[PDB]
Design a protein around this ligand. Structure first.
Ligand SMILES: [Ca+2]
Length: 219
């Protein structure tokens, strides 16, 4: 195989794996760092590690710092991959972000050709740049922010965004993207929001965040 120990879903796809599902990747190509991820092998060329999925409200996303650091949920259904995992993956090279949104027969997307998450000491600082798509550029507002949970507030408000909105995100004061919000909650700022597509009073039915090497698009 080209990559006996594929470090992301694009290497898995380059080995010949073409169907979406659970795959074992190996951080830094290291056999000892196995991580089971869901690969989206069909959207926009495939090769995508999914790290957030919302689709039915069964999982609770009002979780604490340790839980967002470690990941939670069923990776075949609603889940969060974990911030430690995201940092280790984005530290393996130059990665891009894709967000897929679906709601009552409508769809939209956003791609950011530069995406990285810092380590725990940086409180998982977000870098997200180079927008294209149809959802509207709602992540720009969050670029440069650290992550916040109700028990570790790093946002730019004197209040606690995560506590107030009962979610977690790279909050500022507070958000334009809230994809770890309260499922089906159309109250202002509470739901699964992508502001520049459907605003702050509409919770989106289906959302995925996913990443892959940015140069994979050029292959
Ligand atoms: Ca605060």
């Amino acid at each position: 195989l080209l990559y006996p120990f594929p470090k992301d879903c694009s290497q898995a796809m380059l080995n010949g794996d073409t169907t979406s599902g659970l795959y074992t990747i190996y951080l830094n190509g290291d056999k000892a760092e196995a991580l089971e991820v869901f690969c989206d092998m069909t959207s926009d060329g495939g090769g995508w590690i999914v790290f957030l999925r919302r689709k039915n409200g069964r999982e609770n996303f009002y979780q604490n710092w340790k839980a967002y650091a470690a990941g939670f949920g069923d990776r075949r259904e609603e889940f969060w991959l974990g911030l430690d995992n995201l940092n280790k993956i984005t530290a393996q090279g130059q990665y891009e972000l894709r967000v897929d949104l679906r709601d009552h027969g409508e769809t939209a997307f956003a791609v950011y050709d530069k995406f990285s998450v810092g380590d725990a000491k940086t409180r998982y600082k977000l870098k997200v740049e180079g927008y294209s798509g149809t959802a509207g550029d709602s992540m720009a507002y969050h670029n440069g922010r650290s992550f916040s949970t109700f028990d570790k507030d790093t946002d730019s408000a004197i209040t606690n965004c995560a506590l107030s909105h009962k979610g977690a995100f790279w909050y500022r004061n507070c958000h334009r993207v809230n994809l770890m919000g309260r499922y089906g909650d159309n109250n202002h700022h509470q739901g699964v929001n992508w502001f520049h597509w459907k605003g702050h009073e509409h919770s989106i039915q289906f959302a995925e965040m996913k990443l892959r090497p940015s140069n994979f698009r050029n292959l």
